[PDB]
């Protein structure tokens, strides 16, 4: 949609015209530690954010589960002008900084896609586990490798493979080397 | 004319090829090597303290 | 195929898939595994292999300073994926081992190599993603084992279309075979379920479980999954802080996929070397710490030296602290007898008045040692101690461990013993009499070691603690549990005028010493200090917190004490005097437990000073401690007739 990519090209010009303290941008600091794979920091305010456009980050958060892949492409876009990065990591959105709290008991059925904030506190402690995000499957009808396996909310299978014959209706194989994961904790 | 050899700086010599093994197999796809976790990697063969002093002479 | 840093836009798990640069790397460590070029030039390598055959073990190990050093070039290329590497170099031990010894292949092939000494060690904490698919070093306390596991991994099922049965399958945890691709080009037939033709492969899993020495008050403990194959079975066991290399590798299920939309999701580690390490950390430590502790162990009150040091936070009680300091090394359990194992810990038992801080001396040790623990009294009971049932999930049988048993040759600290319950008193005095423990579970067998030193502190019945009873009777406790410590020296405060000018004194001393504002100007700007040293009894210099460090990981496994022969045979008739007295006023006899436990505090002692052997000023010592310990569980009016009797004895140095 044409309404998506608005609020991206807009967006990242906000990290290079609203200044921070001096003459320099508070994100400039932060795209030098960017460089090194181990560490991928990217807060966002939203009390400064709304000092340049205010219709604009409107529908940002009233719409943020459609407009997920596209601030990961709009940030990757901007970090490679500073510097050329090598296309194997991903990264993820840390907006943070939200001066409206919700609460617990205050929730509807039209609650989704709209990034809010909870309160509360956690008791219970779960250890971590992983998550297939980006992937590798191979046909064992006619053994070709797929790349480029996505996965949503389900099982995202592949029900069209290369060749326009035959298909897998059943089951894959899971990549060893070829598949990128993203641990997390279910508190 | 001939050659000489102390004590303290035939240590820093070979060291340095025991140093650039914990920097590059790390580096690429791990985490950065710092100052503080990369003690105890240079205290196995060597059974010296590193601080930093040593660093200001390299 | 010579040069390997051009990879030609090519990633690690590309330029080693096929066959060009693999011709010149597999011919170059066949032929250094036969010429083997060492130090001074011993072929050691070409014996290994008459070695591993004798009792058919397939682990063929080999130093990584070795192949580092001949090939500088290699020293890198191998840390990256090593998972294909290894693979392919089992079939070229395959092709030496039958070239010499024909009469090896009538045994099983498949010898899986090893590798040991990694240049890397990575904790259990910071291993996440970035580290999947990667051989890394990580060490880790075994929390628990299982035994032999028939795991389903081929069945026969009888077929009848083709003269041809259905097999072999693949039905393990490591990958199996989805219905819809089968191996035989695709063919499926009628089955029939046998009774004998089930060949089970070995599977096990362990626990992994972070170090108690690194281990904070504010921190939640994890675990790990450690899945180890064949070959390496049945070498760790639950409580020992062990070695096991493996790669970081996610979790391949295949019981959910066909229910589940989303599989079991777990990073495990698969097996490939073991190394059970205890002797090993003392031969790896540094060198200019073993100078500067001689020249200080030359003067003739390192006796005093670590005496004032302990609990520097109360003073007085000069008496409790030198039983803790003893307490620590555990002595040498070693076997006295022919057939029988006799242990050999030093067990203290405290038991003080409710109001003089008894819990504050325990603290201490535990933070100056390298692994200690805490517990309550209500916090646990005979589940969880040392062992307890199964795996309510698909039918599984796995044993558990307690506390005891992670705390392997360490010191334990248990809170609140009086008021213990009775059930759980008497089932702890299997755990203090031999050092181990053999679970009869699912008929499965097996003898571990735990190596523990009870500590606990009692409080009096009701009220306050009595002096005008015996310490056996005013503490709600068995009697059996009594007769299995050492040490029982107690102290009663009271009001006393010529001596408490020293407890107000001390306590507010310690009180700007040990403040977050006074530390900005002490231990935050080095080289400046506020307050020097507190005078202690002795006028020795204490210790600061690096110097009982690196004290117990050096003394402790260096210098063995052996057993002599001098006047020992003086203390028999000793023994004669008090056995025949102690009934004349009122007391109880001393059994034998006073008589063979001072072996303990003599090889104490000596470690200290660094004495190869026991010395007569050892054994000295020795006596006054086991004597004014006993004295504090009678009537203080029988005190005149022991006190006074055998002053020569409680009067040495």
Known sequence: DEVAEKCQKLFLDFLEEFQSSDGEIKYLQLAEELIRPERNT?????????????????????????????????????????????????????????????????????????????????????????????????????????????????????????????????????????????DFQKV | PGLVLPYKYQVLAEMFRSMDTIVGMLHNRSETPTFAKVQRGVQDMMRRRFEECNVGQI | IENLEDLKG???????????????????????????????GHNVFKERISDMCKENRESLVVNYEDLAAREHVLAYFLPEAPAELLQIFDEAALEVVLAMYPKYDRITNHIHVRISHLPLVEELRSLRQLHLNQLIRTSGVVTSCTGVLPQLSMVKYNCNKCNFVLGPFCQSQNQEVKPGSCPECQSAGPFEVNMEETIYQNYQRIRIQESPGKVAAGRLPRSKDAILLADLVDSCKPGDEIELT?????????????????????????????????????????????????????????????????????????????????????????????????RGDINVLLCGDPGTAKSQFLKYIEKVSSRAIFTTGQGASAVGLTAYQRHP??????????????????????????????????????????????????????????????????????????????????????EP?????????????????????????????????????????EGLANGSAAEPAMPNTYGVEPLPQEVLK???????????????????????????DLRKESMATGSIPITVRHIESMIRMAEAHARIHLRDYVIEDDVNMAIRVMLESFIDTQKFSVMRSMRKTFARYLSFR
């Open chain 3, 481 to 521: 549990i009594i007769s299995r410590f050492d040490i029982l020296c107690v102290v009663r405060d009271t009001v006393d005028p010529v001596q408490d000018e020293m407890l107000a004194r001390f306590v507010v001393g310690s009180h700007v010493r040990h403040h977050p504002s006074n530390k900005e100007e």
């Open chain 3, 246 to 342: 493996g790669i970081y590798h996610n979790n391949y299920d295949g019981s959910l996929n066909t229910a589940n939309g989303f599989p079991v999701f777990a990073t495990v580690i698969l097996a490939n070397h073991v190394a059970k390490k205890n002797k090993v950390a003392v031969g790896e430590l540094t060198d200019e710490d073993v100078k500067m502790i001689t020249s200080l162990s030359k003067d003739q009150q390192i006796g005093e030296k670590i005496f004032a040091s302990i609990a520097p936070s109360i003073y007085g009680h000069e008496d409790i602290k030198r039983g803790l300091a003893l307490a620590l090394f555990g002595g040498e359990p070693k076997n006295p007898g022919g057939k029988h194992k006799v």
């Open chain 3, 10 to 40: 090519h990633s690690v798990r590309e330029w080693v898939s096929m066959a060009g640069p693999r011709l010149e790397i597999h011919h170059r460590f066949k032929n250094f595994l036969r010429t083997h070029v060492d130090s001074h």
């Open chain 1, 42 to 182: 990217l807060v966002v305010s939203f009390v400064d954010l709304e000092q340049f456009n205010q219709q604009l980050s409107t529908t940002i958060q009233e719409e943020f589960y459609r407009v997920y892949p596209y601030l990961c492409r709009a940030l990757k876009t901007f970090v490679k002008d500073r510097k050329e990065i090598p296309l194997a990591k991903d990264f993820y959105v840390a907006f943070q900084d939200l001066p409206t709290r919700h609460k617990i008991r205050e929730l509807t059925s039209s609650r989704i896609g709209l990034l809010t904030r909870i309160s509360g506190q956690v008791v219970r402690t779960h250890p971590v586990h992983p998550e297939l995000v980006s992937g590798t499957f191979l046909c064992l009808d006619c053994q070709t490798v797929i790349r480029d396996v996505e996965q949503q909310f389900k099982y995202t299978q592949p029900n069209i493979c290369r060749n326009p014959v035959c298909a897998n209706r059943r089951r894959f194989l899971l990549d060893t080397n070829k598949s990128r994961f993203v």
């Open chain 3, 550 to 576: 690196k004290y117990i990981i050096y003394a402790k496994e260096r210098v063995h004490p052996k057993l002599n022969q001098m006047d020992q045979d003086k203390v028999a008739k000793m023994y004669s």
């Open chain 3, 393 to 478: 999930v698909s039918r599984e049988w796995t044993l558990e461990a307690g506390a005891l048993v992670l705390a392997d040759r360490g010191v334990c600290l248990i809170d609140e013993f009086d008021k213990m319950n009775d059930q759980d008193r008497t089932s702890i005095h299997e755990a203090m009499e031999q050092q181990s423990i053999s679970i009869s579970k699912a008929g499965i067998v097996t003898s571990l070691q735990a190596r523990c030193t009870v500590i606990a502190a009692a409080n009096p019945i009701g009220g306050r603690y009595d002096p005008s009873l015996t310490f056996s009777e005013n503490v709600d406790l068995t």
